[PDB]
Design a protein around this nucleic acid. Structure first.
Ligand code: FES
Ligand SMILES: [K+]
Ligand SMILES: [K+]
Ligand SMILES: [K+]
Ligand SMILES: [Mg+2]
Ligand SMILES: [Zn+2]
Lengths: 119, 53, 110, 77, 86, 168, 295, 54, 193
RNA sequence: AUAGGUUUGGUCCUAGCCUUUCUAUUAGCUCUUAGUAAGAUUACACAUGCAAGCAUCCCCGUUCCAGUGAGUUCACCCUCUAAAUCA
């Protein structure tokens, strides 16, 4: 299906069953359906902790580099996975979200302390 | 394999392209704005709230 | 060197010479019958540009693809007449032959 | 999803999307992180492009590729 | 059927009869035993010293049904059905 | 039984036993053979037995055969460059002819091995997808990973039907 | 200066290869598997001897000894410590590079811990991940229960040692702690109960001999070899012991006495061999029987 | 610097090829000129609203 | 009924009663399914015992209550495996119901996992051609300068308080749509006491 | 297909029909729970609601996704070469 314009993107295609998500990392045309035609499969991502307490991520790093070198864009969740792997720098929004959580939890410790102290 | 010509598809295409050049809207039409409702009367679309001031 | 014509080199039998500077050539390929797994000839007609009009009906010719088609159906040119009808030169010995008999003995020129 | 020809909903006629409030400190810090992040990622992308372009050339006109071509031509002759 | 079955089974050539007629060893090759050559029969008389001529292409009559099955061309909903132990 | 003499020739097993895979230069192979004469027996056997094997391995090469046009049998190959390779086959056996053309115009065993290894890389063991293309369809098949809900019901806490009820 | 032979040295390989032996009937024992109708060939004696020779060649490939490797050192290398990510995620991420054409021991497998540390995966995690993505026939992601002590004793009680070793070779890597532990435990049961014939004509005999020689307990194997009229193997075993322990009482004894053939066993029996008395009696019995047959 | 993983993979290739060096691999970001987001774009390549009037 | 062998199921197969009933033939030797036609249904019945009530023609396992399908009753399990090939007979072969065939398959696998039932264990090749552990992937990578000094990998991970002039400029741009300014974040993640 | 029933007073041959196996819809009668997958007969006509916005104005997007199977060798390979992505 020849689309008007568009570009290749490395993104997460949702698989699995209800309440059991499983993602396949694929380089696909921007306009293609999420779970439809893709150019190449570049890995997988199990977001559910396994028996060993691990979230498994597969990354075909040789082919990910090839497709980025051919002009493929990246989805935000994919950029964040590459950051956690150490292949890219940490995405700014993971840093900011980590800081937002720190501030939230620091504010939570005040009310908790006041209750135990005042009462 | 010989595709049957579609002449009306080519006629309409040329007519449309021509009309788009002869009836093209002017800058004074496109980029007008109602300063009370803050909408472009050409399309009736509101401007973003951050451009209002 | 690049050509848009699919068949680059093909051998065929000249079957018609009624068009001007165009020889109609029948080309046969062996195609596998999927059920019987036996090879049967499949034939296709090719128009070949014959600038000098030297093709005779029945001669075997080698066609080379033209860079681009010169006419609606003329996609090849006469590269060589492999066997002239009734005037075959034995490629192995280079002597004129009539079927399976030498017209000039290969021993004439040693 | 709707097409350009489908009419707009009546309920949404008067919907005005108000933009979010801006935290000055977080806003400036976040703006710089985006600039630094995208500079590093654009440098990485450039390296990956050069690698892709080098491999294509190496297969087409590389020393090993051209050596094999001559060897094959010699063996044919 | 009965008369045909007894006619065929009675006229079968044992491995010993083959070795004696051919004057050659009958060597059994089993996939479960790898390349081990298992000699099932040897010629009781003298053993020929010339190897049996190996015909490049065997001029044997093949049953289409066998060939058709080996090529995965035979679909049958009735073949290889689960049945009681016989 | 199967029709014709030597029915083995009409089996996929026999047709895949040819060892002659022409180089990409070969475009047309012409076979000139005589139907009678003892000096042409090998060429006749080569046409009877081996042309099907050669064609099966080289589907895009045109093979054309000509009977009783010359006193002696010969092969001629037309290469894409325009070179013509004449191979005289008189007095040779059909096996010798098959071996001669493999040497001069056939891909060696190394070249074929490489092509087969390139095909191996097309199918990646780690890729998950339909059985036609991949070994496993879902990660749930891998032991240790959370199993498919169709086989093992997920814990009530991991199901969205109850993630909302507990919250509200 | 003077390097002691490694397991893969040509000299050691020749000695251990001969000590193993080649029983074609044991090497190609009929496997209990899905069967097909056997094929038959009419063969001359010359052709039969050529096929038997080819079976000997194939059997020697099947018996190629696995290389004995030293226990791998635990991997504990931290690539980075992004402390900002501490507390954001509750579960660790394992990232495996699944690029096809990479040797499995040169693949980068890293773990992002909940603390934010990006560390290289441990040997155990590495092996588990390579099985998940490059599944090998006969290997399981979760360790089979057969390797527990109680279950291995059952396998030994049934004289299924070669099976235990084939299971271990498929599951664990040669330098893994589990691999070396299971192999040694099997080697120690063979020694205690004198079951050295179980591993003969298998690729696991050399490893068993190598284990015994480097731990100085070649007594049981020597006795068995003599009792079975395998002096050539017994002498070679004593010789090899001397080469791997050159500065030893027996090695010096043989040097001092220039012992050869049966003498080497006597010299070793008295000096170093723990069961010196039993060896002499066993060797005595053999030499007496041999003298009779010579007559 | 290169990010954690990429750095480790570049250093491993050095050691594998035999090159023994302690220099740090680093990305040359001097070529990348990050312009502000409000830098005037090219008006020649920009489109125009269509004729449909309200 | 209550069989006395549930605790030691292997005993029944060595008792006199078993030898009188079965002898040396497998327990399923005499069973015959009742079905219409010459070709039987390709599945056996789901279960021979429904709500503690046995059907008319109980399968070989369900007709004898003393036969216990247990991973330890190796002699009973062996009867349901091919001695020459080692494959577990499919249920139509012996006539066991689907319920008992599933239990038999699980017990056979458990016995094989525990080493009680012998099965063909093949000799496999090594996973790796080379066993060297010298590559950086498995060795120790030289620590990066930032890791040695304890700094963040990139300087922009850390929060740097913006200058006051820039904050005032943002406060003019977003007049009337401003949040409370946020200072530097906590140095580490707090925790609920 | 491992086959079976059926021509005749009877036998043999040939032959069609049907039986036994496995699925999918619909109908009758009947039906406890959980998880999962799947789910108009009709390219017939459609009440009502919703399904495309975003954004300091310009542009961009609404040409996608989603739907259907009416029509029907435009789908694949090669040659050549636009638009598009690689700031
Ligand atoms: S198929 Fe894997 S979760 Fe259902
Ligand atoms: K009938
Ligand atoms: K916009
Ligand atoms: K249709
Ligand atoms: Mg362009
Ligand atoms: Zn039952």
């Amino acid at each position: 299906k020849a689309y008007r314009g568009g570009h290749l993107t490395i993104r997460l295609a949702l698989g699995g069953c209800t309440n059991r998500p499983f993602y396949r990392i694929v380089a696909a045309h921007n306009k293609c359906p999420r779970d439809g035609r893709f150019v190449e499969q570049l890995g997988s991502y199990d977001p559910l902790p396994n028996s060993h307490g691990e979230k498994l991520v597969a990354l075909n790093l040789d082919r990910i580099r090839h497709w980025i070198g051919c002009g493929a864009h990246l989805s935000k969740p994919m950029e964040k996975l590459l950051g956690l792997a150490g292949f890219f720098p940490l995405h700014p929004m993971m840093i900011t979200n980590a800081e937002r959580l720190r501030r939230k939890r620091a504010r939570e410790v005040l009310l908790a302390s006041q209750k135990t102290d005042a009462e | 394999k010989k595709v049957r010509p579609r002449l009306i598809a080519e006629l309409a295409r040329r007519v449309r392209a021509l009309r788009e050049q002869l009836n093209r809207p002017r800058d004074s039409q496109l980029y007008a704005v109602d300063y009370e409702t803050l909408t472009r009367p050409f399309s009736g679309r509101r401007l973003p709230v951050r451009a209002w001031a | 060197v690049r050509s848009s014509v699919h068949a680059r080199w093909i051998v065929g039998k000249v079957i018609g010479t009624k068009m001007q500077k165009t020889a109609k050539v029948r080309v046969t390929r062996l195609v596998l019958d999927p059920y019987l797994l036996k090879y049967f000839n499949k034939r296709k007609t090719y128009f070949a540009h014959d600038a000098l009009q030297q093709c005779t009906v029945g001669d075997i010719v080698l066609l080379r693809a033209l860079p681009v088609p010169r006419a609606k159906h003329v996609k090849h040119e006469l590269a060589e007449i492999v066997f002239k009808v009734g005037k075959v030169i034995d490629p192995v010995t280079g002597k004129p032959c009539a079927g399976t008999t030498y017209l000039e003995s290969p021993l004439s020129s040693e | 999803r709707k097409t350009r020809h489908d009419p707009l909903a009546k309920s949404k006629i008067e919907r005005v999307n108000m933009p979010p409030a801006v935290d000055p400190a977080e806003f400036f810090v976040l703006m710089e992180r985006y600039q630094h992040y995208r500079q590093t990622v654009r440098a990485l992308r450039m390296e990956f492009v050069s690698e892709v372009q080098r491999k294509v050339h190496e297969a087409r006109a590389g020393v090993l590729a051209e050596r094999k071509a001559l060897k094959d031509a010699a063996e044919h002759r | 059927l009965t008369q045909g079955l007894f006619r065929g089974l009675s006229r079968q050539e044992t491995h010993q009869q083959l070795a004696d007629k051919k004057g050659l060893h009958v060597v059994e090759i089993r996939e479960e035993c790898g390349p081990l050559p298992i000699v099932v029969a040897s010629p009781r008389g003298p053993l020929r010293k010339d190897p049996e001529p190996e015909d490049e292409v065997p001029d044997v009559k093949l049953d289409w049904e066998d060939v058709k099955t080996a090529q995965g061309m035979k679909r049958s909903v009735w073949s290889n059905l689960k049945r009681a132990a016989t | 039984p199967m029709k014709g003499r030597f029915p083995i020739r009409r089996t996929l097993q026999y047709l895949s036993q040819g060892n002659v895979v022409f180089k990409d230069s070969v475009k047309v192979m012409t076979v000139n053979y005589n139907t009678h004469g003892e000096l042409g027996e090998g060429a006749r056997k080569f046409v009877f037995f081996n042309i099907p094997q050669i064609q099966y391995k080289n589907p895009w090469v045109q093979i054309m055969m000509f009977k009783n046009m010359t006193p002696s049998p010969f092969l001629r190959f037309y290469l894409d460059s325009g070179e013509q390779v004449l191979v005289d086959v008189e007095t040779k056996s059909n096996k010798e002819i098959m071996e001669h053309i493999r040497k001069i115009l056939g891909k060696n065993e190394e070249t074929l091995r490489e092509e087969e290894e390139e095909k191996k890389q097309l199918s990646h063991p780690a890729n998950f997808g339909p059985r036609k293309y991949c070994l496993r369809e879902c990660i749930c098949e891998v032991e240790g990973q959370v199993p498919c809900p169709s086989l093992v019901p997920l814990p009530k806490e991991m199901r969205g039907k109850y993630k909302a009820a507990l919250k509200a | 200066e003077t390097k002691k032979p490694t397991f893969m040295d040509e000299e050691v390989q020749s000695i251990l290869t001969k000590m193993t032996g080649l029983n074609l009937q044991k090497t190609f024992k009929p496997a209990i598997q899905e069967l097909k109708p056997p094929t038959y060939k009419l063969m001359t004696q010359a052709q039969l001897e050529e096929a038997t020779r080819q079976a000997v060649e194939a059997a020697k490939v099947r018996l190629k000894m696995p290389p004995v490797l030293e226990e791998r050192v635990p991997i504990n290398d931290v690539l980075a410590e992004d402390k900002i990510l501490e507390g954001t995620e509750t579960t660790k991420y394992v990232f495996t590079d699944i690029s096809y054409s990479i040797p499995h021991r040169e693949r980068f497998i890293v773990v992002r811990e909940p603390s934010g540390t990006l560390r290289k995966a441990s040997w155990e995690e590495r092996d588990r991940m390579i099985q998940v993505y490059f599944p090998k026939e006969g290997r399981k992601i979760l360790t089979p229960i057969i390797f527990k002590e109680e279950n291995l004793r059952t396998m030994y009680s049934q004289d299924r040692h070669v099976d235990v070793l084939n299971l271990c070779f498929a599951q664990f890597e040669p330098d893994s702690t589990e691999y070396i532990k299971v192999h040694h435990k099997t080697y120690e049961d063979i020694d205690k109960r004198g079951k050295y014939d179980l591993l003969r004509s298998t690729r696991y005999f050399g490893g068993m001999v190598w284990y015994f020689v480097n731990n100085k307990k070649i007594d049981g194997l020597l006795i068995d070899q003599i009792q079975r009229d395998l002096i050539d193997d017994a002498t070679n075993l004593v010789q090899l012991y001397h080469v791997l322990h050159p500065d030893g009482q027996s090695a010096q004894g043989a040097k001092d006495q220039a012992a050869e053939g049966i003498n080497l066993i006597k010299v070793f029996a008295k000096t170093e061999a723990q069961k010196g008395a039993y060896i002499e009696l066993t060797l005595q019995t053999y030499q007496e029987a041999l003298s009779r047959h010579s007559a | 610097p290169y990010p954690p993983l990429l750095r480790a993979m570049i250093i491993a290739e050095r050691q594998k090829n035999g090159d023994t060096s302690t220099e740090e691999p680093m990305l040359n970001v001097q070529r990348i000129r990050m312009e502000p987001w409000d830098y005037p774009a090219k008006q020649e390549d920009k489109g125009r609203a269509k004729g449909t009037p309200v | 009924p209550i069989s006395p062998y549930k605790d030691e199921p292997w005993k029944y197969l060595e008792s006199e009663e078993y030898q009188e009933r079965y002898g040396s033939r497998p327990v399923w030797a005499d069973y015959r399914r009742n079905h219409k036609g010459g070709v039987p249904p390709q599945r056996t019945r789901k279960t021979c015992i429904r709500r503690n009530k046995v059907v008319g023609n109980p399968c070989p396992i369900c007709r004898d209550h003393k036969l216990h399908v247990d991973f330890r009753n190796v002699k009973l399990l062996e009867q349901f495996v091919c001695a020459h090939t080692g494959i577990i007979f499919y249920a139509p072969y012996t006539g066991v119901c689907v319920k008992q065939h599933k239990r038999l398959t699980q017990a056979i696998q458990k016995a094989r996992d525990h080493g009680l039932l012998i099965y063909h264990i093949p000799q496999v090749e090594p996973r790796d051609l080379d066993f060297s552990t010298s590559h950086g992937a498995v060795s120790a990578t030289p620590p990066a300068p930032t890791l040695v000094s304890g700094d963040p990998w990139y300087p922009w991970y850390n929060w740097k308080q913006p200058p006051e002039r820039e904050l005032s400029r943002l406060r003019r741009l977003y007049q009337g749509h401003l949040q409370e300014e946020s200072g530097p974040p906590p140095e580490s993640m707090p925790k609920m006491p």
